[PDB]
Amino acid sequence: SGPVPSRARVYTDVNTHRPREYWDYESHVVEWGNQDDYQLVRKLGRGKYSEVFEAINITNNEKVVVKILKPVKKKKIKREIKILENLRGGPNIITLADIVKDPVSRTPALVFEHVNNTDFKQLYQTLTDYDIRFYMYEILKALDYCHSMGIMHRDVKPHNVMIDHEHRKLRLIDWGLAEFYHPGQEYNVRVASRYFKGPELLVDYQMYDYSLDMWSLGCMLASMIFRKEPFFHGHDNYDQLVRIAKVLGTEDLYDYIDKYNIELDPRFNDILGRHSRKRWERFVHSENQHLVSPEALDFLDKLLRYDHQSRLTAREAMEHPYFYTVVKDQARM
Numbered sequence: 335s336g337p338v339p340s341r342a343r344v345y346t347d348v349n350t351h352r353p354r355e356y357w358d359y360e361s362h363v364v365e366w367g368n369q370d371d372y373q374l375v376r377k378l379g380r381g382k383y384s385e386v387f388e389a390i391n392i393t394n395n396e397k398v399v400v401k402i403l404k405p406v407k408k409k410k411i412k413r414e415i416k417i418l419e420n421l422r423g424g425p426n427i428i429t430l431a432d433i434v435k436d437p438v439s440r441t442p443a444l445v446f447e448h449v450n451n452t453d454f455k456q457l458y459q460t461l462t463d464y465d466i467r468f469y470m471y472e473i474l475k476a477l478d479y480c481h482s483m484g485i486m487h488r489d490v491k492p493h494n495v496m497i498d499h500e501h502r503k504l505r506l507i508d509w510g511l512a513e514f515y516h517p518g519q520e521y522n523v524r525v526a527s528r529y530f531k532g533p534e535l536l537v538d539y540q541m542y543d544y545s546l547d548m549w550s551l552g553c554m555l556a557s558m559i560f561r562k563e564p565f566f567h568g569h570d571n572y573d574q575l576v577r578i579a580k581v582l583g584t585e586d587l588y589d590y591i592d593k594y595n596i597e598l599d600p601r602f603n604d605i606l607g608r609h610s611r612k613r614w615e616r617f618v619h620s621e622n623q624h625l626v627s628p629e630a631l632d633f634l635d636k637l638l639r640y641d642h643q644s645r646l647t648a649r650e651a652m653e654h655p656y657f658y659t660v661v662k663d664q665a666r667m
């Protein structure tokens with residue numbers, strides 16, 4: 335048997351046509367700075383891979399953000415650093431300003447730009463229909479760039495999207511799981527938050543591409559327009575696929591399995607059963623109908639697909655009628 339191979343429909347060989355230095359990050363040499371150039375003000379958040387502090391650049395008295403990294407392989411550190419430097423300057427990509435090492439503890443610390451972030455737990459209450467469309471378009475601009483730069487984020491989630499609603503600014507952060515795309519490469523399925531794990535990550539299909547990020551975005555869009563965060567709320571990875579199967583149906587799931595000859599785990603076939611593909615009207619009620627339109631539902635359906643190749647690309651998504659009002663307003667400046 336063996337699973338059927340896969341290639342990205344867009345930006346397939348962009349990395350092949352680049353210098354080895356670009357994607358071969360194990361050979362990247364980091365230029366460190368002194369963390370005594372920064373004074374920490376307060377902890378902004380914790381996490382599995384880092385603890386994030388607000389800090390001050392004492393050489394110019396300007397607010398920055400210090401991400402003190404948790405002990406991971408040196409390889410993964412170089413990967414995140416190289417990717418950040420490669421994507422630096424891109425649309426709504428977080429800006430890496432410095433890379434310092436504490437003189438005492440000798441720990442790697444990435445220094446980022448400061449953005450007045452309002453948390454989505456309080457932000458998703460003041461968002462209008464236009465606000466959702468607008469910010470979705472902003473994430474797409476960041477995703478289309480990094481995809482065109484041969485990089486998939488592999489960890490798209492609300493926690494990783496900083497938003498300055500007062501200044502309409504958006505930034506895509508945390509690229510510690512991001513990876514360079516190479517046609518034919520089998521990647522680790524152990525990426526992204528459980529609720530945003532694509533079906534390929536759950537059925538153990540390792541040859542995925544940029545389309546993984548498009549799934550996660552779909553989970554964000556579903557959460558926003560239906561006011562259910564998170565939309566696919568599973569208790570583990572096995573149940574996660576079941577929660578997905580209860581919406582998109584088991585019909586397309588087993589066709590997905592059959593097409594790519596994916597050997598399915600002997601546990602799934604006992605908890606999946608059979609389900610019909612529910613219409614998106616079944617998730618529309620009085621409290622969220624002001625966010626749901628035929629344009630909204632059409633755009634969503636074209637993101638949440640088992641077959642990663644049938645999902646929209648970032649650019650294809652940016653040309654959807656769902657963003658027609660946003661595009662016209664951005665052209666008038």
Ligand SMILES: O=C(O)c1ccc(-c2oc3c(Br)cc(Br)cc3c(=O)c2O)cc1
Pocket residue numbers: 378379384386399401428446447448449450451496507508509
């Ligand atoms: O690469 C990362 O993992 C990564 C994490 C956090 C920030 C990051 O977090 C903020 C938080 Br949390 C709260 C507030 Br207020 C501001 C920020 C901010 O400006 C900022 O860059 C940037 C990048």
